[PDB]
Ligand binder design. Structure first.
Ligand SMILES: Oc1ccc(/C(=N\c2ccccc2Cl)c2ccc(O)cc2O)cc1
Ligand SMILES: Oc1ccc(/C(=N\c2ccccc2Cl)c2ccc(O)cc2O)cc1
Lengths: 232, 10, 231, 9
């Protein structure tokens, strides 16, 4: 497994190059409950295709069986979409940048039931990222950690060995940025604790999506349905 | 099987 | 502001002394779905009272307002119960020690709908703790982290972050004392905190299940208030 | 609220 052989710099470099593109939403401005969830479902369905190919580039992910890869993506897919959201929305306080042509605030989420709560949580996460001055190299580490950790409790040593490698990478980045030893394990702790909130927001998102599937208040795509039926 | 299987192989 | 002044050893001491008792169930060897969930609900209801008084002893918690204290518990109560469960179940492989007189395996959870999934996840968490050889000192640290972290995103909020960083230093201090290398300290710290993501996941799934059998029939008046604090 | 009460007793 070449993933374990990578240096911290080689780890960061591989993850930065693997980054999915920032996709755009469908155009012609004008927001109803149907139109909003329509755009987001469309947007997510397209991001999933890049995510899957991004996951293949995450060091160590290819070493897993096909079944394991499926399961890890099925568990983490909404988390990964969400941490992407709060990251690119970072320098837009009070706003969520779903797409460069789709910037939403808390007021917009209210036109959909139970959407305001998840919005406020996402905004809070983004504000947390902004407060910590999260770096891109840290972000791509967190995202990959989410991919490998979120489903690993449902071979196994390999994922743990890769998880430790990314930890070393995060510490290396911080030590390079001049952080003291104490500042390194505090910041590491602060970062990983966010993943608990991201997990929570995902779970809340899943409920909402399963809700609108049992209401037809937007038609989900066939790939998005399969991802959702994995959390039934 | 599922779509995810195909996208992970293609 | 005494929480920020505690040394790492004084921190661990305070947390250990604050530990709630291990309560017994009313398990009285009959041979059902109703009975099992009734026992667990009754147990959880009694554990909550100890959890509330335990939360008071967690350094820094008292400094928060009443509304903040309420919200932090309303968020994390099932997480805390669950990490307590997997911890006392640690050296009972394949079993869940809800109480000293209530030890269950995966076969029992099947007599309740959707209960199997949560059971296996709890079993896996306990197996993970066992593999890591988790210490009591590390456990009481994680538990208090859960309390302060699980609802901090819903001049004050900086205090929680200051205390959270304090517990982090404590964890590292524990590991450095155990002879772990600086690389091993970082890695283990990460491994521990990553568990909390799964504990959060198990909690959320648990809430769904409890919210299900609620409007399907009997939860206690305290456990209802804790449940209406979510969805 | 029961929780608010027990948090004071
Ligand atoms: O059908 C869907 C699926 C996902 C979302 C969504 N998130 C949610 C998912 C469920 C409930 C609420 C939200 Cl905000 C989301 C989409 C794209 C993206 O880059 C980031 C995202 O967070 C939207 C529609
Ligand atoms: O009404 C309830 C509340 C909680 C549980 C339970 N956990 C669950 C909560 C929801 C679903 C499934 C489970 Cl196993 C639990 C109870 C006590 C304890 O020390 C640890 C626990 O994990 C049980 C009944």
């Amino acid at each position: 497994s070449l993933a374990l052989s990578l240096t911290a710099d080689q780890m960061v470099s591989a993850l930065l190059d693997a980054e999915p593109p920032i996709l755009y939403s469908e155009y012609d401005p004008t927001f109803s409950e149907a139109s909003m969830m329509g755009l987001l479902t469309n947007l997510a369905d397209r991001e999933l295709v890049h995510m899957i190919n991004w996951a293949k580039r995450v060091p160590g992910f290819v070493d897993l069986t096909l079944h394991d890869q499926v399961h890890l993506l099925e568990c983490a897919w909404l988390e990964i979409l969400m941490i992407g959201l709060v990251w690119r929305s970072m320098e837009h306080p009070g706003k969520l940048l779903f797409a460069p042509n789709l910037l939403l605030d808390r007021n917009q989420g209210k036109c959909v039931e139970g959407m305001v709560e998840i919005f406020d949580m996402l905004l809070a996460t983004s504000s947390r990222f902004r407060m910590m001055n999260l770096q891109g190299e840290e972000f791509v580490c967190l995202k990959s950690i989410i991919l490998l950790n979120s489903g690993v409790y449902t071979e196994k040593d390999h994922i743990h060995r890769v998880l430790d490698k990314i930890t070393d990478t995060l510490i290396h980045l911080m030590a390079k940025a001049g952080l003291t030893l104490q500042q390194q394990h505090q910041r590491l702790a602060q970062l990983l604790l966010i993943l608990s909130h991201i997990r929570h927001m995902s779970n809340k998102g899943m409920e909402h999506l399963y809700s609108m599937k049992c209401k037809n208040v937007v038609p989900l795509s066939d790939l998005l349905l399969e991802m959702l039926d994995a959390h039934r | 099987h599922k779509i995810l299987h195909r996208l992970l192989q293609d």
